[PDB]
Every structure is written in structure tokens, then in C-alpha cells.
Amino acid sequence: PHRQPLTSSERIDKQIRYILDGISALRKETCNKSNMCESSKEALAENNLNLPKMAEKDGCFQSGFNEETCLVKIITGLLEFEVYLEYLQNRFESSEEQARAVQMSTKVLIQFLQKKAKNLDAITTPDPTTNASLLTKLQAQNQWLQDMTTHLILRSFKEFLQSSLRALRQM
Amino acid sequence: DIQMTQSPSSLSASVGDRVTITCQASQDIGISLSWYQQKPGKAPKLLIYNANNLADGVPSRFSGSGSGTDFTLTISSLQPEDFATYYCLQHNSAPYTFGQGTKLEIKRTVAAPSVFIFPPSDEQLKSGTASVVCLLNNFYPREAKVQWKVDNALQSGNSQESVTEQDSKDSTYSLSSTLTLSKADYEKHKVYACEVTHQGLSSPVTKSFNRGEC
Amino acid sequence: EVQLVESGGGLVQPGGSLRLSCAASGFNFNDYFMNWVRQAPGKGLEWVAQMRNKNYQYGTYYAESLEGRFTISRDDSKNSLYLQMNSLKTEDTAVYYCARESYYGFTSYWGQGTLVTVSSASTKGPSVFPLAPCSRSTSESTAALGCLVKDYFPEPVTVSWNSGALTSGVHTFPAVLQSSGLYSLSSVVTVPSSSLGTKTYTCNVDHKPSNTKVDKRVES
């Protein structure tokens, strides 16, 4: 079935939904094994994590909406998530393709959004050295802490993309 | 790597007393710390896992406490079988790390050693070496000084010592000191003596023999 | 029951290499992380290495103090864990325990351990000499006798008295390492002095590394 060309915004919308679908498949696999995403003591794994999240000051919610500050926050947030998506690559075999897809699709999305931004002056790029050490730190942990880290990343990334999707529909 | 500081290194306590052992981690490890008990000649035994969970069959007088960097093992009303070496294990992030260990020993009343001296055997002497052995049997506390004298001359550098683990029935120690000489030096002398100083003795006790009388 | 059995221990020259093995049974070996832990004679526990499973890409971690001299590996088709040790030094002399790591990270099961001795000394059976006083005491109610187990290598030796029938009052002391590189220990027993000459006392010494067995009847 044929259609007209997607606009930039429609392309972005479709990209986010594709990533969410992939995150969903990853979540399903994680929660069907090991601790079954039992989350009572997840605060323990959260200590080592600085996961991006929306706040009202970011201007991504309908109330207090601000297109410029929101877009900056989404791009900055997604750039910060990338080290955590790299972490996820080793945690899924029997789902290699899916974890790979989520990671690649997020990179494509970042580029779409950076095109939409111009300028990128307010965009804080995460430090590679800090990211390499963080990744090492996360991988060194025992299996239980790694299962919890995995679940926290998936949930938090899902939440960030859901809020991003809603905000980008207003742009 | 995460470093562990376990305290104290050694602890002397009475049966029925309460003791605490602490471990500090060099960074936050959450609750990912476990406590091990080890008896002489045996593999370590898990007592407490994930900071506060008692292992199967572990008596409830054992309890673990703490989170983050500071952890405590408490033992209430020590029983004789509880005297051993205790270790914490950091198992948050590899490489995992054991603490330095706490050796927990029974406090008992002072017991003076029985002292015995043994000359070298004729069988050993055939081979050119003479071992003179002094035994201190069943004393408390562990601290004891043994000094060797040959024809009244204080010896240095030619003896080695060995001390047993605390006895499982009477809570005492025993010490064995060996003086080593060539057959030639052994034969040049007459009086072989071991002098023992210990808290249980009001004055030092000397045991000796004369070489030609054996 | 879970069983972990170490092999491959023994003596090795300074600078040498040794490969330890661990045969696991009674559980699905493939699913578990495994560790090596070591303990130098009379010293504290030292965590050595971790071998992860397939799910974790067979990742390996090592204590930093080892400076990369050791290599851990596994063979899941044989239910076996390995520790390849290189550039060995005397401070690597220890009992080495194979251990199963919990999901939670703590060590849950241990092998009995295998002794590795790093030394220039060669395997040597002990000479066993009697320990008996110069003469019998007439005053004292307690007598001591024993055996000196001299110049053997490596550890360990086992000593019993009267084929295991005499255990009360027995003290078998920790070996001392002599400047020659050989070990020496004494085993003593205290007995009522009235027993002397009414009964035989024989120490039974066993040194598996040299396959030596010695009975020494002590006359006092």
C-alpha cells in the first residue's frame, strides 16, 4: 500500500514507537527469567545509576510546555542513555538482534532530533571516559544487581521515550 | 578494587559472652556482604548472606547488620563451638574481597605449662645433626618465653618454635621449641637447658639434662 | 549433593607454571559462576578469580594482587573449572579452593582444597626420631614422649599414636620451615608416669607426597 512521504515529525514519531516496541520485547524476556523483575530492593542498583528523567522544569509536559527547552532535554537525555544501551547488549543473547535494533534505532532518532534542533549549543555531551568507567563498574556487579540494573534501564528508558513521544506530538 | 577493613584482628572472649565484629568497605556495596566461619583444617562455612540473612541451620545467636559501607556480625552468648576465625566477604563487584579475618579465642583461667626437655636420639646423632626439643604442655595464656642455654650460655638464632591451636577440650596452648646444632657442637658441651617464663609461673622454670647421662 | 573436587596441586619451582582442575557434580555446572579462593598456611582467605557462564560471555575477573599471572577457564562439556598459574612465587604457596558462586555473589559451596607449594626443594620423606627424656623421673606424675618428624617436603604429614587408639593428651605441632627448605615438626603425648614400661607407644607417620609410612616405637 502506497502513501505520501512522511514529515520529519511523523518520521520521529514512528522511530520512537519502533524503539518502544523493541524495549517491550526486551522487558518481556528479562521479566520471564531470574528474579522475574521483582523490584523491592531495586534502590540498591539505582545508586550507581544517573538515569535521565523528565521534570516540570524541562518544559516537556503540557503544563509549562516549552518546545526549545524540551527538545534540548530530549536530545541530552537520549545521549546520556546510550552508555546504558551499550550495557544492555551483553545482557541479551537469544535476543541479540532486538537489543541491537533498540541501540541502532536510538542513534537514528538522535540524528533526526539534532536536525530538528539547530543549534546544539545547550546540548551537553556525556564524557567518553566517564562512560567507559561507568560501563566497567556496571559489568563488574553480581548477577542479582545486574538483573536489577537491566530492569531499571529498560523501565526508565521506556518512561523517557513515552514522555518524549507526547511532547514531540506538540512540536 | 573494593577494599575491606575487618576489625578486630583477634578477640579473646568467655563462653556466654557477646561479641561484635565489624567490616568497612572502601565504597558502597549495598547489602552485598556475607560472613564466613572457618575452623582449623576445614573449608569456610557461610553464616550470614546479603548482610543479614542467616544461612540454613545457622543458630540464631548469629546475626548480621548493616548496609552501605559499615557492617557488623554479632554473636550473642558464645558457645564453645563458636570459637573460630570469621571473615567478611564483599560480593558486590568483582574481584570479590575477603576481610583480613577475626580470630576468636576462648578466655579461661591461667594455667602454668608442664615443661619437658628431650635430648637428640642416638639414631639422629648418627646423621651429624642434633635436635634438642623443649615442650611446654597445656598452658594459658598463649604468651610464653622459652630461652635455651648450653653450659649456661644463652643461645640465639639456632632455635625454632611452634604453637598449637587452642585445645578444643581445655582451651590451653602447647609450645614446642627445637634447638638445632651440628653433632660436633653438641658433643662439645655438657648441660642443655630450657628456661620457661610464663604468667602462671611465679619464677622461671628450667628443665635440663647432661649429655653424657642419656 | 553438590561436589567440587580439586586436582593438580603439588610442588612447583619458583617461576614455574601449574594447572589446577576442579571436577564439579550434583548440579548444572553450566548455569553457575565459579570462583577460586586461596589460603596461605596460617593466613587469611584470599579471593582469586571468577569464571562466569555462557550467558555472561565467559567473562573472567582476577584479584589485582595477582598482576595477571593467573588464568581461569572452564569446560562445560566436562563440568570442570581450571586455574592456570604462571610465574609462580613462594608467596603463592597456599591451599587453593574451588567454589560455586551464588546468583547473589556470595560463595555457597567449597571444595576441600588442594595444596600448592612453590619452592626450589625436592620431594623428600621424613626422618622420624624418638622424643624421650634423658632418664625417667621418679618425682613427676606425668611423663612426656613423642617423635620428631624431621626434614620432609612438601607438606603435609599426618601423625597418629598407637594406630589411632591413643588420642588423649596428644599434641601434633604445626610444621616449621627450616632454612634448608625442608619442614620439621614434633608430635608429643603426655601419659601417667606409672604407665611407662607397661605399655608400648608408637607414633605412625604418613607422608603421601613421598609415599612414606613410618612407625616409630618410643622407649621411655
Side-chain angles (χ1 to χ4, degrees), chain B residues 33-41 43-106:
Chain B
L33 178 137
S34 290
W35 289 100
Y36 288 84
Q37 181 189 68
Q38 191 184 31
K39 311 262 201 156
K45 190 204 174 186
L46 176 72
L47 293 178
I48 308 292
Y49 69 95
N50 282 350
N52 55 57
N53 305 98
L54 269 76
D56 286 339
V58 172
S60 55
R61 64 184 176 276
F62 292 95
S63 71
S65 170
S67 210
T69 61
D70 299 303
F71 299 83
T72 304
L73 175 69
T74 299
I75 318 170
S76 59
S77 200
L78 254 7
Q79 299 184 18
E81 64 269 28
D82 299 336
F83 293 84
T85 303
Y86 290 85
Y87 298 90
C88 56
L89 172 69
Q90 180 285 109
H91 53 94
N92 178 285
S93 295
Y96 302 154
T97 329
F98 287 99
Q100 299 88 327
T102 295
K103 193 183 204 170
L104 174 59
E105 290 177 302
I106 306 183

Side-chain angles (χ1 to χ4, degrees), chain B residues 75 108 118 173 185 191 195 199 202:
Chain B
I75 318 170
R108 59 148 289 158
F118 310 102
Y173 301 89
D185 285 349
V191 184
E195 192 191 49
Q199 191 187 325
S202 58

Side-chain angles (χ1 to χ4, degrees), chain A residues 56-98:
Chain A
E56 201 173 320
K57 61 165 187 175
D58 302 319
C60 287
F61 305 137
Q62 295 186 310
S63 173
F65 187 82
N66 186 303
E67 187 188 322
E68 281 200 0
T69 70
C70 182
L71 188 57
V72 168
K73 173 63 175 186
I74 297 170
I75 296 161
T76 305
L78 294 174
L79 285 167
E80 293 168 351
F81 265 113
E82 291 205 276
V83 67
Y84 302 100
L85 307 181
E86 180 53 38
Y87 169 80
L88 294 177
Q89 299 313 300
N90 295 317
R91 295 306 323 119
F92 299 92
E93 254 75 26
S94 156
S95 276
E96 147 103 302
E97 179 181 349
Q98 189 59 96

Side-chain angles (χ1 to χ4, degrees), chain B residues 36 38 96 123 138 162 176 214, chain C residues 39 101 107 134 171 174 216:
Chain B
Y36 288 84
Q38 191 184 31
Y96 302 154
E123 191 190 3
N138 296 32
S162 188
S176 172
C214 306
Chain C
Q39 184 163 43
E101 173 178 342
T107 316
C134 193
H171 296 303
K216 182 61 62 169

Side-chain angles (χ1 to χ4, degrees), chain B residues 1 34 36 38 50 87 91 95-96 116 118-119 123-124 137-138 160-163 174-176 207 213-214, chain C residues 39 44-45 47 50 62 64 101 104-107 129 132 134 140 144 150 171 173-174 176-177 186 190 216:
Chain B
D1 304 13
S34 290
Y36 288 84
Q38 191 184 31
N50 282 350
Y87 298 90
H91 53 94
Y96 302 154
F116 309 88
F118 310 102
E123 191 190 3
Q124 182 188 26
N137 193 69
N138 296 32
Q160 291 185 104
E161 264 181 21
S162 188
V163 181
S174 297
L175 183 156
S176 172
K207 295 293 175 174
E213 299 181 10
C214 306
Chain C
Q39 184 163 43
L45 260 18
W47 192 89
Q50 172 191 75
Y62 302 93
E64 76 185 340
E101 173 178 342
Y104 295 105
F106 59 79
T107 316
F129 305 114
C134 193
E140 304 166 349
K150 198 175 156 69
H171 296 303
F173 291 86
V176 300
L177 183 57
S186 59
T190 55
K216 182 61 62 169

Side-chain angles (χ1 to χ4, degrees), chain A residues 34-35 90-91 93 139-144 146-147, chain C residues 31 33 52-53 55-57 61 101-105:
Chain A
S34 297
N35 68 330
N90 295 317
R91 295 306 323 119
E93 254 75 26
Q139 292 167 332
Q141 293 177 118
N142 67 64
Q143 294 161 78
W144 177 54
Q146 294 215 38
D147 279 352
Chain C
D31 295 332
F33 286 21
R52 299 182 166 186
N53 55 21
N55 191 229
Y56 279 77
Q57 300 80 47
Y61 284 81
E101 173 178 342
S102 177
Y103 173 69
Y104 295 105

